Amino acid sequence: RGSHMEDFVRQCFNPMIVELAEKAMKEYGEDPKIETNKFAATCTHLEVCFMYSDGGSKHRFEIIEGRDRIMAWTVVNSICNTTGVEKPKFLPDLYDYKENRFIEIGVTRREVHIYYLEKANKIKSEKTHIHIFSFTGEEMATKADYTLDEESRARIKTRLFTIRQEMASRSLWDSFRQSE
Numbered sequence: 001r002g003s004h005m006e007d008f009v010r011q012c013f014n015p016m017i018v019e020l021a022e023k024a025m026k027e028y029g030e031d032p033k034i035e036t037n038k039f040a041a042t043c044t045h046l047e048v049c050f051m052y053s054d055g056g057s058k059h060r061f062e063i064i065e066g067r068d069r070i071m072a073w074t075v076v077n078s079i080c081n082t083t084g085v086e087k088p089k090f091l092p093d094l095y096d097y098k099e100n101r102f103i104e105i106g107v108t109r110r111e112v113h114i115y116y117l118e119k120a121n122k123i124k125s126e127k128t129h130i131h132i133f134s135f136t137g138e139e140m141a142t143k144a145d146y147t148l149d150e151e152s153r154a155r156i157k158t159r160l161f162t163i164r165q166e167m168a169s170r171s172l173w174d175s176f177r178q179s180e
């Protein structure tokens, strides 16, 4: 109670994104007032997912992140029973109707190579596409098929660096980076 991180989070991100992040953390037994770096992280991942689905065509993506566990798994079951895609063991973030595959979006404060290595080991199922962004401006996608336009990806990286600058100007960036 009283953290600068919580107030900055609720100020820097959009009210719907803050509400969704709060519902998610509470759904997973996590306190946004005590685990405030993770509050920021959930909000950032949520905004990156929304931006990512805003790129590309109109009907292209199905958003999985942001829903509650049960409804997200229901939509996943529908996607699988519709397209015949292998049911992912763990919840992805998006589904691409154009490339016909699930998408796992990563946002890390560490080296992108490491984070993708970790997430690729965790998923193991070599069917789901994996796309990592970084707060330094780096990105890395499975097969190096980055799915979206260059402009749409550049927008996301710019937003990430803006978040990083806003945290640094308030002296919460060191803690955020070392928290991962």
Ligand SMILES: O=C(NCCc1ccncc1)c1[nH]c(Cc2ccccc2C(F)(F)F)nc(=O)c1O
Binding pocket: 024, 025, 028, 038, 041, 042, 045, 065, 091, 092, 093, 104, 105, 106, 107
């Ligand atoms: O989907 C995700 N979580 C789904 C479950 C969940 C959602 C929101 N709140 C709590 C639970 C997800 N989580 C992360 C960060 C992370 C990584 C490993 C374990 C736990 C977490 C965290 F912080 F979320 F608990 N990075 C991603 O890229 C990503 O997709």
Ligand SMILES: [Mn+2]
Binding pocket: 065, 091, 092, 093
């Ligand atoms: Mn997710």
Ligand SMILES: [Mn+2]
Binding pocket: 045, 093, 104, 105, 106, 107
């Ligand atoms: Mn993700």
